[PDB]
Design an enzyme around this catalytic site. Structure first.
Site, PDB file in Angstrom:
ATOM      1  N   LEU A  25       0.799  -1.218   0.000  1.00  0.00           N
ATOM      2  CA  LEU A  25       0.000   0.000   0.000  1.00  0.00           C
ATOM      3  C   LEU A  25       0.833   1.270   0.000  1.00  0.00           C
ATOM      4  CD1 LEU A  25      -3.042  -0.024  -0.122  1.00  0.00           C
ATOM      5  CD2 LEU A  25      -3.126   0.436   2.333  1.00  0.00           C
ATOM      6  N   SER A  27       5.190   2.840   1.279  1.00  0.00           N
ATOM      7  CA  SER A  27       6.368   2.724   2.123  1.00  0.00           C
ATOM      8  C   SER A  27       7.000   4.097   2.301  1.00  0.00           C
ATOM      9  CB  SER A  27       7.385   1.731   1.540  1.00  0.00           C
ATOM     10  OG  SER A  27       7.543   1.924   0.145  1.00  0.00           O
ATOM     11  N   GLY A  28       7.759   4.237   3.381  1.00  0.00           N
ATOM     12  CA  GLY A  28       8.403   5.509   3.678  1.00  0.00           C
ATOM     13  C   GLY A  28       9.074   5.481   5.034  1.00  0.00           C
ATOM     14  N   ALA A  29       9.147   6.662   5.655  1.00  0.00           N
ATOM     15  CA  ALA A  29       9.786   6.771   6.963  1.00  0.00           C
ATOM     16  C   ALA A  29       9.051   5.956   8.018  1.00  0.00           C
ATOM     17  CB  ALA A  29       9.866   8.239   7.386  1.00  0.00           C
ATOM     18  N   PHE A  30       7.733   5.804   7.873  1.00  0.00           N
ATOM     19  CA  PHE A  30       6.942   4.999   8.795  1.00  0.00           C
ATOM     20  C   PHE A  30       7.205   3.507   8.655  1.00  0.00           C
ATOM     21  CE2 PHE A  30       4.590   6.219   5.006  1.00  0.00           C
ATOM     22  CZ  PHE A  30       4.238   4.994   4.471  1.00  0.00           C
ATOM     23  N   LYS A  52       1.621  -3.202   9.061  1.00  0.00           N
ATOM     24  CA  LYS A  52       2.765  -2.303   9.146  1.00  0.00           C
ATOM     25  C   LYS A  52       3.985  -3.045   9.670  1.00  0.00           C
ATOM     26  CE  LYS A  52       4.160   2.059  11.386  1.00  0.00           C
ATOM     27  NZ  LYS A  52       3.681   3.124  12.309  1.00  0.00           N
ATOM     28  N   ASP A 141       3.850  13.547  17.511  1.00  0.00           N
ATOM     29  CA  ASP A 141       4.011  13.544  16.060  1.00  0.00           C
ATOM     30  C   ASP A 141       2.651  13.733  15.390  1.00  0.00           C
ATOM     31  OD1 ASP A 141       5.089  13.450  13.554  1.00  0.00           O
ATOM     32  OD2 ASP A 141       5.649  11.330  13.604  1.00  0.00           O
ATOM     33  N   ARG A 145      -0.186  14.190   7.828  1.00  0.00           N
ATOM     34  CA  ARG A 145       0.257  12.894   7.328  1.00  0.00           C
ATOM     35  C   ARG A 145      -0.082  11.759   8.284  1.00  0.00           C
ATOM     36  NH1 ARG A 145       4.648  15.700   9.181  1.00  0.00           N
ATOM     37  NH2 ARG A 145       5.670  14.729  10.984  1.00  0.00           N
TER      38      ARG A 145
HETATM   39  C1  LIG Z   1      -0.156   2.970  13.405  1.00  0.00           C
HETATM   40  O1  LIG Z   1      -1.317   2.286  12.985  1.00  0.00           O
HETATM   41  C2  LIG Z   1      -1.157   1.371  11.984  1.00  0.00           C
HETATM   42  C3  LIG Z   1      -1.079   0.014  12.254  1.00  0.00           C
HETATM   43 CL1  LIG Z   1      -1.196  -0.647  13.866  1.00  0.00          CL
HETATM   44  C4  LIG Z   1      -0.910  -0.957  11.273  1.00  0.00           C
HETATM   45  C5  LIG Z   1      -0.817  -0.521   9.959  1.00  0.00           C
HETATM   46  C6  LIG Z   1      -0.878   0.831   9.647  1.00  0.00           C
HETATM   47  C7  LIG Z   1      -1.046   1.829  10.625  1.00  0.00           C
HETATM   48  N1  LIG Z   1      -1.117   3.182  10.264  1.00  0.00           N
HETATM   49  C8  LIG Z   1      -0.668   3.862   9.095  1.00  0.00           C
HETATM   50  C9  LIG Z   1      -1.297   3.863   7.815  1.00  0.00           C
HETATM   51  C10 LIG Z   1      -2.554   3.185   7.316  1.00  0.00           C
HETATM   52  C11 LIG Z   1      -3.339   2.486   8.255  1.00  0.00           C
HETATM   53  C12 LIG Z   1      -4.532   1.836   7.928  1.00  0.00           C
HETATM   54  N2  LIG Z   1      -5.020   1.811   6.678  1.00  0.00           N
HETATM   55  C13 LIG Z   1      -4.307   2.470   5.749  1.00  0.00           C
HETATM   56  C14 LIG Z   1      -3.092   3.159   5.980  1.00  0.00           C
HETATM   57  O2  LIG Z   1      -2.479   3.806   4.935  1.00  0.00           O
HETATM   58  C15 LIG Z   1      -1.329   3.281   4.296  1.00  0.00           C
HETATM   59  C16 LIG Z   1      -0.573   4.434   3.509  1.00  0.00           C
HETATM   60  C17 LIG Z   1       0.844   3.968   3.140  1.00  0.00           C
HETATM   61  C18 LIG Z   1      -1.345   4.770   2.200  1.00  0.00           C
HETATM   62  O3  LIG Z   1      -0.495   5.569   4.364  1.00  0.00           O
HETATM   63  C19 LIG Z   1      -1.392   6.645   4.144  1.00  0.00           C
HETATM   64  N3  LIG Z   1      -0.485   4.698   6.994  1.00  0.00           N
HETATM   65  C20 LIG Z   1       0.602   5.207   7.702  1.00  0.00           C
HETATM   66  C21 LIG Z   1       0.507   4.711   8.993  1.00  0.00           C
HETATM   67  C22 LIG Z   1       1.523   5.076   9.984  1.00  0.00           C
HETATM   68  O4  LIG Z   1       1.665   4.516  11.052  1.00  0.00           O
HETATM   69  N4  LIG Z   1       2.396   6.164   9.695  1.00  0.00           N
HETATM   70  C23 LIG Z   1       2.337   6.928   8.450  1.00  0.00           C
HETATM   71  C24 LIG Z   1       1.721   6.118   7.261  1.00  0.00           C
END
Ligand SMILES: COc1c(Cl)cccc1Nc1c(-c2ccncc2OCC(C)(C)OC)[nH]c2c1C(=O)NCC2
Length: 310
Positions: A25, A27-30, A52, A141, A145
């Site tokens: 879906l 990738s990046g700093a997260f 994640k 944070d 974003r």
């Molecule tokens: C921390 O919670 C989470 C847990 Cl436990 C497990 C998985 C994801 C998250 N959360 C985050 C999503 C995301 C979550 C849910 N559905 C869609 C998402 O989008 C994916 C994307 C790459 C398009 O990002 C916009 N994205 C991001 C985070 C994040 O942590 N930091 C920044 C980018």
């Protein structure tokens, strides 16, 4: 001895065989995030999920720190941890937010976002932040974003990699060295590495400015090493063109030097909720009154995680 209440949160460990249709879906700093279908066995339910991961013992330690924080939160505007998977590397499992992060959303749909949605998002983010303050949790944070879009009408706060739990009677968190979002931090955080709920309030004000500018970069072009001295001279982010003085004054109060003079999250809720009752009185958007915002074999048993409890 003395201290807090026992954190009786449940940590769900999910089998790898319960996840299907895993696609990348972003990738990046997260780290890297996947989308997939979580199918709990014995239950005729399919739950859209995101996955994640950051296999270093450093990464496993930090991803578990985030799991601890997220397993202890239960609020409609805070991302809920569905569980962790213990494979090669440790993965976090959460509800799928199909519309992405709010920063990309406002940029993509600039011309179809009205004052109603903008002010409602400000209410929901303040509701989640006020809940985190209720749990004595400093996010550290908060940014556009790090706000995810379940539906255009429902957003949740995400990414708790920097989040810290303040002990009872403890008021501040004294951090150390490490990459930190300088352009979202309060001056006392940049100067003295001090973080409170009121420093989150500063980051809230920057996040609101992000939405009201439809995704503009704060201090675009300024090197991060200059933000400290610029804030010390009294300079702040400019007033967005769609913002009445009512809304911008709320942002300016989030950026006061005196942290106790900034508004409380519970007050941000009240103020933005009043404005969301008459949105065109507080945000001036070109053509606001004429704006609209929104597999197959799985459909039968698909259930959103918000309706899947215990
Ligand atoms: C921390 O919670 C989470 C847990 Cl436990 C497990 C998985 C994801 C998250 N959360 C985050 C999503 C995301 C979550 C849910 N559905 C869609 C998402 O989008 C994916 C994307 C790459 C398009 O990002 C916009 N994205 C991001 C985070 C994040 O942590 N930091 C920044 C980018």
């Amino acid at each position: 001895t003395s201290g807090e209440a026992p954190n009786q949160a449940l940590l769900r460990i999910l089998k790898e065989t319960e996840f299907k249709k895993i696609k990348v879906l972003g990738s990046g700093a997260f780290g890297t995030v996947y989308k997939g279908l979580w199918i709990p066995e014995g239950e005729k339910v399919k739950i859209p999920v995101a996955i994640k991961e950051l296999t270093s013992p450093k990464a496993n330690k930090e991803i578990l720190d985030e799991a601890y924080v997220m397993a202890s939160v239960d609020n409609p505007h805070v991302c809920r941890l569905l569980g962790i998977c213990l494979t090669s590397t440790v993965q976090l499992i959460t509800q799928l937010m199909p519309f992405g992060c709010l920063l990309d959303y406002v940029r993509e749909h600039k011309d179809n976002i009205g004052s109603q949605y903008l002010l409602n998002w400000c209410v929901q983010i303040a509701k989640g932040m006020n809940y985190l303050e209720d749990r004595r949790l400093v996010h550290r944070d908060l940014a556009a974003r790090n706000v995810l879009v379940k539906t255009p009408q429902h957003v949740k706060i995400t990414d708790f990699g920097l989040a810290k739990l303040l002990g009872a009677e403890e008021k501040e968190y004294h951090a150390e060295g490490g990459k930190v979002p300088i352009k979202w931090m309060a001056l006392e955080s940049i100067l003295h590495r001090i973080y409170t709920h009121q420093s989150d309030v500063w980051s809230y004000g920057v996040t609101v400015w992000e939405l009201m500018t439809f995704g503009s970069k704060p201090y675009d072009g300024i090197p991060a090493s200059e933000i400290s001295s610029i804030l010390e001279k009294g300079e702040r982010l400019p007033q967005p063109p769609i913002c009445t003085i009512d809304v911008y004054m709320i942002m300016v109060k989030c950026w006061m030097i005196d942290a106790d003079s900034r508004p409380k999250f519970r007050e941000l809720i009240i103020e933005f909720s009043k404005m969301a009752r008459d949105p065109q009185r507080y945000l001036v958007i070109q053509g606001d009154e004429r704006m609209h915002l929104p597999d197959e074999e799985d459909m039968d048993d698909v259930v959103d995680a918000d309706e899947y409890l215990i």
